[PDB]
Structure formats: structure tokens, C-alpha cells
Amino acid sequence: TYSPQNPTFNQGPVLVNGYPVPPTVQYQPRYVMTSAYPLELDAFTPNTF
Amino acid sequence: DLSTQTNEQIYKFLQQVLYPSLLISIDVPEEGEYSWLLRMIPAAEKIY
Amino acid sequence: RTINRTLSRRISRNTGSEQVLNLRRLMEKYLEDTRFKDDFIFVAVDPNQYSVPYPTLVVMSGAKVGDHNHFFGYVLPLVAGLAPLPRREEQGPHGNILVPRTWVDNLNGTFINEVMAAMYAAIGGKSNGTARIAGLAVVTNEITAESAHLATTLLSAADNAIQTAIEIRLGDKLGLPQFNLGMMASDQPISSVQYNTSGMQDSDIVGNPVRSDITVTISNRIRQAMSDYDSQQRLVATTGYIDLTYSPQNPTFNQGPVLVNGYPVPPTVQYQPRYVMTSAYPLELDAFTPNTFVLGLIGTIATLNSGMAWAQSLISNAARGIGPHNPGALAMVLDPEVTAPLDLSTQTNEQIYKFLQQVLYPSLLISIDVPEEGEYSWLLRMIPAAEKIYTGKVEGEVREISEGYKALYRAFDDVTLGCFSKKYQYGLPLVYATGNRIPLGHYNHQDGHRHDIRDMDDLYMMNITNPDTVEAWEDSFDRTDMTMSQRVVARHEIIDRVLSGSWEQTGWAMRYDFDPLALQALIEAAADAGFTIRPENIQHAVRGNMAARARGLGNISGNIYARSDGAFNLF
Amino acid sequence: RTINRTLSRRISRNTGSEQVLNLRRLMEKYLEDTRFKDDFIFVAVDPNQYSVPYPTLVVMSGAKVGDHNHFFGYVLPLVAGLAPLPRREEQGPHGNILVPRTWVDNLNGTFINEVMAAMYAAIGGKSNGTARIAGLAVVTNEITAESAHLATTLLSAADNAIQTAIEIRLGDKLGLPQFNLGMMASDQPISSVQYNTSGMQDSDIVGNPVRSDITVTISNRIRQAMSDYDSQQRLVATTGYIDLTYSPQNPTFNQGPVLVNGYPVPPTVQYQPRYVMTSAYPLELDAFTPNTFVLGLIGTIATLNSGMAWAQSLISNAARGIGPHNPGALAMVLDPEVTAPLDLSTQTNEQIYKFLQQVLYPSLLISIDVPEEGEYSWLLRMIPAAEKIYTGKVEGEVREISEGYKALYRAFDDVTLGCFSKKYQYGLPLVYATGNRIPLGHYNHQDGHRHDIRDMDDLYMMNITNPDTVEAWEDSFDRTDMTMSQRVVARHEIIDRVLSGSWEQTGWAMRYDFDPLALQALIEAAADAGFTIRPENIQHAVRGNMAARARGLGNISGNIYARSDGAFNLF
């Protein structure tokens, strides 16, 4: 996901886990879940999810 | 082409352009085998 | 364990199968028409009533001497459709490590005790006879109602194992002979070799691939006396491949030069060729016993040394060009500056031979892989048993000698009609242990076939990966301050990284090698018993006079020439 | 052993000496004129009648409480003129190794039992009192009839040790006070530091050199009220040097940046400075106890952090140019291509400081070397005793705490009049063990003096040897999968190769380091008790306005601004 950091707005640096990042970083990784299913369980309920 | 680089070199290359965190998302189908189960996620979006 | 009973559903997608019922039905159906209906007993052992990890079937048969009955069984665990074993945490010098396991790791003493109890319940009791286990093999492929061929093959293997056990244990009392070289006295043995490395490989009884770079066939030649017809009868076959072992020579230790066959070698030579045997099986012989295995070993050794015929494997591999089995990767060893493997597909055979002579020792090491379970593991377990020569038992005068050593020595002596005893001293080594545990399995090749996992060797690492991986692989094969589990972990990690985790493991094997002096004595003893062999496929005028060099007079005796013509003692 | 008696000769070149007779005579001669003639007892133990390895002398003195007598002894083995110990073969993971030994390795429990028996025979019997050992020191230099000064110094050391033991054991019943910071309430403490690295070094009681790169002196300032005279009174001194520890930062593990004092550091920083204390001794104080040691520690910590005063040692060393202590060797660490240490003798101080800021962490680690025997080993053994916080003894509710930890905590709390207890939690760590055994000894320097063997450190290896040796040295200092004997062997081998075998070893030492949180709490508690110090020797206008930056208004609250203005639900 495209997500540039704006330093020119007189804001503080971007901190991830309390640590600053290099000025060239501009993309945010994202994990997308596509499916979930049982293997040896007979029943699949919201708690199993 | 990065097929001739070692793993640490590729990791260092990636550290210059990507944020070191992950966003968790999910695709909810409008109909399917488990749509009845997964429709609970959209239902919780409106708190009040 | 009982989650399904608690949270239950009416219709289930997983129901399981009945492999033991399917296999037993096929075997009985095959036997119902022959005359051996009553010679076999089938015993079903399942975890619901015995403490066993997998469903198994036992094939039993008996023999009677005097008034006593003796029973022998062949065990077949069926594991298709089960989850693979997890990793086990062990204790190391630094900390904890996780070690891979496979199916055979669960077959301990408890399993043997349970199988024996089931067998005794089958025959009637302890008073009805005696029972012993004759073999074991794991079946990893599914058994359906359309698997008649596999059932017939498994039944044949069980029958051969049981019959051989009966012979070895009670031949003298039952008058059963065994193979020896005297039965080949009135005919002419021959041999042949095939080098093939592209395409499908050999397969085992279950159906899994086996590495077969080199194949040797031993036959018998026949001619009709009056009608002049020609024919041959094929006896036994053997498969294997060629590997490399790092072994630098140290001149700086003020030692003498390394001599091979009494000849010095160039200073740049640092790798030792090694031959690894992967399988051996009969062709038209009905029975396969340890003596037949000795015959196969003799034939293979004679063929592979016929004019350096083993180097033809590397020369043939060099013709494909750049690839995982290219011998041109040794150019990087020879010259450090060279960083890319060399292409030798446009060189003549003698040029390639000359190139190889600068980096390899001119001798061969004979080794063998012994599986922990399989079709012929019962036969091949005799090699590990002979590794320990002496039981440390107290001796009145001369130390006691173990039983496995005795069995192997007796086989060698009986095949050659008693000449081995006169050639080799009783008590000298026959077999050495390397200490390496090798995995067995398969993976998907880019040509559409399944290939043996043993394709990953030193040459593969030289051609495919970087030098750090090569160093790590060789180190796990050679270092003496590493335990077995540590070596297993190192090799497993490298294979998993190279293949991206897309492979399947089926078993384990251990590697042993023979003593060269014992092998030379065996060849000489076989010759002294009247046995000769004629290889038929070995390939490779020259100007000059060769006899003139040997007739030169160098030096003469020196007696033919006329001979020419205070402080210390002070006190 | 009795070869000389068998093959004997009338005149012998080796006759030996009587060190115990010489030393005892000198001590008694010194005491014969004072008023303490009857306060001391001298006991001679020799191998001819007791099971001891060396000739030893014991100095004893007593104290009486009630009707009971208590006796304390100081032990002095004399080893000049004997052959050095041989190497001992040990067991390793791979095989056998030969480990060096020195004089102290022979002083085991049997030696202690024999010394105690001799002491009991001296005083009359078990019914005449009780005996305890108060200290131990090995004398490696010869004693002749012209060694009065050495005898007097040894007697003084023994007296101080015995008196301190009596105080610690029986002060409450005997009414004996101990030092604390309340006695410095009406005066002004001061401190001074000297950086010297060329020439002679400091010496111990026997006369062997001690590494003294940094020396700190703690004094007291006095002014006469009416006459206005000025004077100072010197109390205690401390010596030590600066070392380096390899400690790379790993950014690739997806962790946060390394923060020192809440500030990030440049990516090229990879070495951690370390301060090692080598000795501490009194100057004009007659008594030296654990409380006095605490005062010395407080003074040293306060002085070394006064405006980065410790980096002045490296800056001063950089002025000599190319040599074994040149900090310019770190240029090879910074840039790989650079292969020769840099010369920094023509740079200004700020330039050198800027160069150092690119490779070093801006903090200091406090460590100490504890000798296994020596003049003050009885005092300094309390540091190792506090390393184990908890005895694993079963607890009704709260786990039991050990006695050594209690003693160290009590000393810290008593010196500061009970403020340390309010600042630091009871049961938190105070001391860590590194696990490294360090040799003690000396060698011949090219300037004509004997130098401490502790001159061989990381910087020496960087400047003198090749990078492989540097890697081996650091690895023996840091790897956790190496036993103690293996590290000792590795370091011994490197030193022997560098010095060509021309050196002498005298003893052993172990290295410990303090907890930084405990040290900060100790400094704060000392301040809260009314104690202040004024360093007098610390060195290091600037344009600009520094207060203007702090008065800038950055941001304001956002509340001051006016605010603007089917499938899922199907069933």
C-alpha cells in the first residue's frame, strides 16, 4: 500500500516500535487472508475461527 | 534482478523501502461455503 | 483426542479406509487357486486391541523338525493416509536442538513384544511351537481394490525371506543346499555395464525411485552342442553412483609423498573418488540369499576395475554441458581465480581424462548404503553386525570373536570353497563404520518425474550453490567432533533451503565401507576356485615398440673392475 | 627421589637456603625494641614434618572475650628457588588437553587442614582457644639477611588483616567502630587523576609491576581558621586501564535502534569501552577495611564520569604515534580497504574525539580483577561471594537470601548511613560473573624495565599481529560454548607465540563487573548523606546563545480552533 511520509509539514518523524525509519521508506506491507477451513475437526464454528 | 544475491543482502535492500510492520486484513465473500460464519466481521463495524 | 465426540456433527468428510482388509483379501484371492492354500497364516494387528502405532499385517509360515514346530513371520506396517511425525527435542553441548524423525523411528522394543504376542495367539500357544520375526518393511502407498500386482510382489518377497531363514537355521538337519561357485564350473560367466543419467530411474518394490547412474548385470553364456544355438541367462543386477570426498595431502608435515600403487601423484590432487552401492536384486533366479549377494559383489568389483571403467561415468556426464552433474566444476578447485564452472562438451575423451588426472586420486573406495527397513534389510543387516570383531569377554588365552564377524567370514569362505581362509588371516578387519545417517525420499524433477533425494551430493553443491554451503556440507560429512544428531540437523537444513521445502522423506540408511585388503583376497580366492569372468561392454592403434624399453641393461656389478693398488691419549 | 643418596658425591654445588629462618629472624629483630614483643606468635611449617608443598611461616595473634580466646593467623608460603609446576592433562569434548598451572593451584583442602593442625599445636590445644585463617599470600622473591624493609612491610600487612578480622567478627561485643561518610561532614573532599603510560609502572608488596594507565587519588582539604594555612591529607588511591569489547549491533533482526542515554548512535559503532580496576591501597590511613574500599569506589566513579574524563586516556595515548597502544588501529575496523593503522599525532583533540565518536559507544563498563591470593585478597573475596543471590533452600513463603550478598549489601548501606536501602530494592543484582580466568606475571620490556603481562589486550593485537589472531583472542573472551580450561589454553598459546616464550607467570585472577543500576543508586545515596566531591584536575569560549533554544514554543492544543460544521443483513 502506497503511504508516503510527509516531513515538510513540520511534524515529528515517523516512529515504528519507537524507532525512526529511513527517509526513503514509502510502502506499507499488508497481509490478506483468503480462506480458513478445518482439517480433522468435524465442526467449524466462530470459536474455531 | 536479485537472483544472485544472498538473503541478508535482499533483506537490507528491502529495509530501505518498506515499513517494518504488518497490517492484518481479510476478504469476506458475499456468498459461499462459509459466508454465514464470516458475516459476523462486517456486523461488528458499527459500534453504536 | 476425543474432541469429535464432544463437538460432534452428523455427516463427516473424513471416514478413513481399511488397508489391512484390502491387502489380506487380495493375497487370499491370489492363493485360493494354487496348491499352497494352507501354507500361510495371516494375522491382523490393529491399535484398537494391541499397543502398536500403525495398522500392520503379518504373514506366517512354518516348518517341522522332529516333533517340534518352528514359525517365522514377515511384518508389514501400512502408513498411507496418516500425519507425518513431528520433530523431537534433544540435548546438545550448547543447548537444545530439534531433530527430524520418520516412520521407522516408532518401531521400538514394545512394538516387537506386541507383534510376538499376537503371533503366539495366532498359532495356539507357547506349547504349539516357537515364533520368530523374519523381516520388516513399511508400505507408504495406498492399497485399493485394484492393486493385485503389488500384493503379489509383497507375497513373493515374504515367501523368499521366510524360506531363507528356515534354510540358514535348519539346513544341516533338513538337508537344504546353498549357492557356491562350484555350480558355475561348466559354463562361461559374462558381465555388462550401462551408464544412463537422463530420464526415469530404477524403482523399489513400493514404487519409489532409486539412483542408478551405473548398472551392472551378471549373466551366464550357453551354447547348444549340436544345433549351435546361442543364448544367455541373466542372474543378478546392481546399481550405484560415484561421489567425491575431500582429502588434502599434507606435504608440510615433513612426511613422504603420497603413493598410489607405488606411484607418486601431482601436488594438486585433493579429491578421492567413491562408489556407493544402492541396490542389488535377482533377475531370473528365484532365490536370493547372502551367497548370491557375494556373487553380485564379486561381479561388480571385477567389472568396475576393467581398464578404469568407472571414470567413464564422469566422462559421460561431462557431455551434457552446464548442469548439476558437470565435472567441470573442479576447475574452480584447481585455479582459485576461476569463478565459473567450465564447459567441457567440446573436448575429446583423452583431453577430459587428462583434466581429471590433475585433481583426482587414481583409486576407488567401495561403500554401501544399508536401509533400516525395506525389502532386503533382513539380508543386508549382516554387514553392520560384522563391524565389531571382538566381544570383550574374558579369555583364557585368546580373545573371543563375535558372531556377526563369524557369519560374514563364513559366507565369504563358503562361496569360494575354502580358499578365502587360506588367503586372509582370521580376525583381520572386514568392514568399517563411517557414522553417517543418510535420509531416503523423493522430490519432483523439472522433467516430470520423481527423483531420488540422493541426487544432492558434493558435485550438486559445487554446481548450484555458493562455496560456504559446500564447506558446510563437507564438514558435516567429515568432522569427528560432531554427534550424529548434529550432522543430521545440518544436512536437513541445507536440503530444505535448497529445495524450498518441497520434498518427502520416507526412511533412513547408514553408510559402511569395505577393507581393500579383504576385497583383494576375495578376488584372488575366487580365481583360485576356478571362476573367471569376461566383460563384454568395456570400451578402450598406438605407435611405438613397448617391449624394447623392458630389455634395456641398466647397471652391472662393480666387482668386475680392477681395484686400485695427542691430548686424548696423554693419560 | 633418592637418586643423590644412591649415586652420591662428597661436594655438592646446590645446598639450598633457609628462607623461613631468615624471615622469622628479621621480624623478631624488628619487634624486639617496641612494646608489642608478646603480641605475636610465629609458627614454622616445613614439609619434613607436615604434609605441605612449600615452606611456610604463620603469624598469629589473639583476642579475648569473656573467658574465651580467639586466634587468627596469616599464612606466607615462600617459593623462591623451586622448580615451576608442570602442566596437567585434562579431559575435553574432543580429547585431552594440557593446562598450565602456577603456585596457587597446589593450595587445596589438605594444606588448610595441615596449617590448622600446626596452629593448634602452637597455642596448646583445643581447650586453649579457637583458631581461624585470616589471609594468604605467596612470596616469589628471595629473602636474604639484607631484606629488612620487605619483612617490615609483610608484618604490617599481616597485622592489618588480623585486626580487621577481629573487628568484623567481634566489634559489637568489643565496642570497635568502623568508617562511614559521617566522619567527613566538616571538611571538603577533593580528587585528582593522572594519565601516565611511559616509563616505570606501579609495584605490589613483593615488587612486581602493576598496570597503572589511570591513577585516581582521593584527599581531604583543610584550612586553618585564624592563621590561614592550607594543607591536604591523602586517603586512598586506585589504578586501572581501559579495554575494548566487540559488540556489534544487529539492525536486520527487525528490532529498534540501539539507544544510549535515550539517544541513537551511528550505524558504524561496534566497540564497547571497559574500565578494569587493578589495585586499591591506602596512603595515609593506617587501616584498610571494606568500608574504605567502598569510599575508594565512590571516588573513582565520580571522577571518571566528570565530563568524559576517561576518553582522555585514549586521546593521550594517540599522541605517541605508531605503537602498541595506538587508537588509530580502529581505522581498519571503520573502512575495510584500509590495511595499515593510522597516525593521529598531528590532529587536534577535537578531531580525535570526533574520530572516536564513530566507532565507540558513549558509556563505560566497570569491572575489577580479583586475585586468588595476595595482599588484599582476603578483603576482595567479598565480591565473588555476592554473585549468588539465593540459596535454593526451601522457603515457607519467601526464598532465603545468601550470606555474601547480605555482607555486600550491608557494607553499601552502612557507609551511606542507611540511604542505600531506601534507594535500591533488597534482592536485586549487584555483581555479575564473566567466567574468564586471567594470568598474572611479567616480562622484559625494551626500555629496560619489567612490565605487567596485562599489557597484552585487544589493541595490542590489532597493532602488532594479523587479523586471525585478533579473531581468536576475542573469541576466547566471548564465546559461551567454551569451557574455562579451553579459554585458558587458547590465551596461553597466543601469548607464548607473541613473546617467544620469554615471560614468567606468578598467579591467577578472575574478572567481575558491577550492575549499573546499583552504582547509580549508590551515587545518589552518597549524595543524600551529605557527601560532595570536587575534582581538581579535569580539563575541558564558545559562541552562541544556549538559552534561546529551550524557550521555543512548538505546538498548541487543537481545541482552540472552531470545529467544522445487503447480503449480510438479508437473513
XYZ file of C-alpha atoms in Angstrom, chain A residues 37-45 48, chain C residues 3-4 7-9 11-14 83:
20
model
C -11.075 -24.404 6.899
C -10.898 -27.441 9.207
C -8.645 -30.447 8.680
C -9.598 -33.252 11.082
C -12.225 -31.391 13.105
C -15.789 -32.270 12.210
C -17.274 -28.940 13.334
C -16.258 -25.409 12.342
C -17.755 -22.590 14.438
C -12.661 -22.350 15.884
C -12.846 -33.612 20.586
C -15.005 -35.037 17.783
C -18.307 -31.363 19.477
C -19.924 -33.788 17.031
C -21.502 -33.483 13.586
C -22.017 -36.035 8.366
C -18.224 -36.231 8.241
C -15.878 -35.577 5.284
C -13.080 -37.866 6.612
C 0.042 -37.459 9.500
